[PDB]
Amino acid sequence: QDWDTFQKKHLTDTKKVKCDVEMKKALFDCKKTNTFIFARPPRVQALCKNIKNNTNVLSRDVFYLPQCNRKKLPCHYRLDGSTNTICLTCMKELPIHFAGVGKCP
Ligand SMILES: Nc1ccn([C@@H]2O[C@H](CO)[C@@H](O)[C@H]2OP(=O)(O)OC[C@H]2O[C@@H](n3cnc4c(=O)[nH]c(N)nc43)[C@H](O)[C@@H]2O)c(=O)n1
């Protein structure tokens, strides 16, 4: 919804995210899946430069994507990872939504 919320739930400083610990936070509320992006805010923010408001952008470069997928109720997860391009929704040249992986919707 905003740059601040986007960072909190989609950017990570480590490849080994503690899913069971993170996902229980109110931001995630034990949702089925959440994909993290291993990168600093600057690199991610730059993807939205010169992008029309409320439109998506597909990155040219790849990122490692730590992903938490729920395996057992109510909040138990398995950590999965892969590498791929990311689709972000921009607003005022700032990412506010994680739109897709590999391509845009
Ligand atoms: N909404 C979803 C979520 C997960 N999945 C897939 O279900 C598997 C786990 O059982 C994962 O490996 C996913 O494949 P995937 O290639 O990681 O993701 C496919 C699509 O899912 C959406 N998705 C993934 N992570 C996120 C996330 O954190 N947020 C949002 N909004 N969408 C996400 C994107 O639209 C992406 O292109 C899906 O098809 N749709």
Question: Resolution in A, one decimal?
Answer: 2.1
Domains and CATH numbers, the chain: 2-105 (3.10.130.10)
Verify whether ligand 1 is closer than 6 Å to residue 89 (CB atom): no
Local structure of 35: helix, strand or coil: strand
Contacts of 24 (CB under 8 A, 6+ apart): 30, 75
* Count of positions (residues) in the chain: 105
Of 26, 56, 59, 45, nearest to 93 by C-alpha is: 45
- Method used experimentally: X-ray
Burial track 23-59 (b if 16+ CB lie within 10 A, e otherwise): beeeebebeeebbbbbbeeeebbebbeebeeeebbeb
Verify whether ligand 1 is closer than 6 Å to residue 12 (CB atom): no
Contacts of 68 (CB under 8 A, 6+ apart): 17, 19, 22, 23, 33, 34, 36, 77, 78, 79, 80
C-alpha to C-alpha distance for 64 and 70, rounded to whole angstroms: 19
Best residue for ligand 1 mutational test, from 17, 29, 31, 35 (most atoms within 8 Å of Cβ): 35
Of 34, 40, 32, 33, nearest to 14 by C-alpha is: 40
Verify whether ligand 1 is closer than 6 Å to residue 35 (CB atom): yes
Greatest distance between any 2 Cα atoms in the chain = 42
DSSP-derived letter for residue 47 is T
